[PDB]
Paper text:
The mixed chirality α-helices are superimposable onto the homochiral α-helices and form under similar conditions as shown by CD spectra and MD simulations but non-hemolytic and resistant to proteolysis. While previous reports of similar mixed chirality AMPs concluded on either unordered conformations or helical conformations appearing in a membrane environment based on deconvolution of FTIR spectra, here we reported X-ray crystallographic evidence of short mixed chirality helices consisting of only natural residues existing as helix bundles within the protein environment of a lectin and almost perfectly superimposable with their parent homochiral α-helices.
In all four cases the α-helical fold resulted in an amphiphilic arrangement of hydrophobic and cationic residues corresponding to the helix-wheel model and explaining the membrane disruptive activities discussed above.
Numbering used by the authors: 2 to 12
Write the structure that this text describes.
Amino acid sequence: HALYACIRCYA
């Protein structure tokens, strides 16, 4: 939703 959120998600 938040690109910071996004990255976490694939991290």
